[PDB]
Design a protein around this ligand. Structure first.
Ligand SMILES: [Cu+2]
Ligand SMILES: [Cu+2]
Ligand SMILES: [Zn+2]
Ligand SMILES: [Zn+2]
Lengths: 153, 153
């Protein structure tokens, strides 16, 4: 199964995020290419609960969290399903890479198809900040771009 | 279950399409408000197979047709699942209305969540044209706007 989300916004940030999962038990491979970010920085990269784009990136809701856990790093055992951590941007402000994740799925009851992907304006503190907000959003700041994860071939 | 698709494009046409289905066996209620169309006209309104927006509205593919039937009117027994027919536009070029459909579903194997909705530039001939194209696209023309159907609450 394949899916793709085209990140758009009014802040100069844009990109494409591709997802791939052969079967439900398998990890999903997330590939991304995002431009227009601050150069040489880490930026919060998360999957939101809804794919509602009626009010910009705001209507996408909070991080996809079906198991009701606190915000964390992708490698943390306690993290939201949509917690993809930070993506690094180069001297030209482009973030490009890929990784596999075993909580994010394109198949089954927790499928992220129809939900949104958000690239943040700030860095994700990975749930390590001494704040309640750290456990909710990782304090990653505004959402300059987002896109609904749609089906593809 | 609720879903929404925000129709956008570079041709002045835009809008919102809302979907609602309580349970799989139930019809889905499609509500729409679309502006920027030709005034006092009928325009093809369809659901495409993919929600891939990487190449404008083109990457969405053909009409969602899991049962491999020919193009038809929504009331036809032989139609594509994504065949929503034409929507009427008023003297100001706005198409606004709602209807229920029993082939379009937000739940189950034929769910349209993650797929795209397209508003056409031309009228749908409802599969009655004396052309092979009539049985494929209804000859509805270009796709000025489209949006990926995402989950909402
Ligand atoms: Cu976030
Ligand atoms: Cu069409
Ligand atoms: Zn989170
Ligand atoms: Zn059709």
């Amino acid at each position: 199964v394949q899916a793709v989300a085209v990140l758009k916004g009014d802040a100069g940030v844009s990109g494409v995020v591709k997802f791939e999962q052969a079967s439900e038990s398998e990890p999903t491979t997330v590939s991304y290419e995002i431009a227009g970010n601050s150069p040489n920085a880490e930026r919060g990269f998360h999957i939101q609960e809804f794919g509602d784009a009626t009010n910009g990136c705001v209507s996408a809701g909070p991080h996809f969290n079906p198991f009701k856990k606190t915000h964390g790093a992708p490698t943390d055992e306690v993290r939201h399903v949509g917690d993809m951590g930070n993506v690094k941007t180069d001297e030209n402000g482009v973030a490009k890479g890929s990784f596999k994740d075993s909580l994010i799925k394109l198949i089954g009851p927790t499928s992220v198809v129809g939900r949104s992907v958000v690239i943040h304006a700030g860095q994700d503190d990975l749930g390590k900040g001494d704040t309640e907000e750290s456990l909710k959003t990782g304090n990653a700041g505004p959402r300059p771009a987002c896109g609904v994860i749609g089906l593809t071939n």
